[PDB]
Amino acid sequence: RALLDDQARHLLTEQERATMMYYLAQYRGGTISVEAMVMALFELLNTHAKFSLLSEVRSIISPQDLDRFDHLVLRR
């Protein structure tokens, strides 16, 4: 959770960081699927540098959801 929070602070505004943390908490809370979370992040992460945050997000999602995450989020 530290590698992501550190990276988000450098690449996102406070408001954009609040949006990312909101969707991540909705996903962790079981309200939304990993796919709904990914789609929300695609709407938030508009620049090339911002897209790099999804590799940090990958490290904090449930291991059983990694294949679904990778199916929508390009790994390299």
Swiss-Prot record:
Entry comment describing in which tissues the protein is expressed: Expressed in the retina. Colocalizes with RPGR in the photoreceptor connecting cilium, a thin bridge linking the cell body and the light-sensing outer segment (at protein level). Detected in the inner ear throughout development from embryonic day 12 to 20 days after birth. Displays a dynamic pattern of expression after birth, demonstrating an ordered appearance and fade-out across stereocilia rows. Isoforms 5, 6, 7 and 8 are not detected in the retina.
Disulfide bonds: none
Consequences of knocking out this gene: Mutant mice for isoform 1 appear viable and comparable to their wild-type littermates in growth characteristics, reproductive performance and general health. At 2 and 9 months of age, knockouts show a profound hearing loss across all cochlear frequencies. At 28 to 33 months, they show signs for retinal degeneration such as a thinner photoreceptor nuclear layer and outer segments shortened.
Localization terms from the record: Cytoplasm; Cell projection, Stereocilium; Cell projection, Growth cone; Photoreceptor inner segment
Domain of life assignment: Eukaryota
Quaternary structure and interacting proteins, as annotated: Forms homooligomers. Interacts (via C-terminal PDZ domain) with MYO15A; this interaction is necessary for localization of WHRN to stereocilia tips. Interacts (via C-terminal PDZ domain) with MPP1/p55. Interacts with LRRC4C/NGL1. Interacts with MYO7A. Interacts with RPGR. Interacts with EPS8. Interacts with CASK. Interacts with CIB2. Component of USH2 complex, composed of ADGRV1, PDZD7, USH2A and WHRN. Interacts (via PDZ domains) with PDZD7; the interaction is direct. Interacts (via N-terminal PDZ domain) with USH2A (via cytoplasmic region). Interacts with ADGRV1/MASS1 (via cytoplasmic region).
Annotated disorder: Defects in Whrn are the cause of the phenotype whirler (wi). Mutants are characterized by deafness due to malformation of the cochlear inner and outer hair cells and by circling behavior. Stereocilia are shorter and wider than in wild-type animals and there is a decrease in the number of actin filaments in inner and outer hair cells. The number of outer hair cell stereocilia is reduced with increased spacing between them.
Physiological role: Involved in hearing and vision as member of the USH2 complex. Necessary for elongation and maintenance of inner and outer hair cell stereocilia in the organ of Corti in the inner ear. Involved in the maintenance of the hair bundle ankle region, which connects stereocilia in cochlear hair cells of the inner ear. In retina photoreceptors, required for the maintenance of periciliary membrane complex that seems to play a role in regulating intracellular protein transport.
Protein name (Swiss-Prot/TrEMBL): Whirlin
Taxonomic source organism: Mus musculus
Residue numbers of the full-length protein present here: 424 to 499 of 918
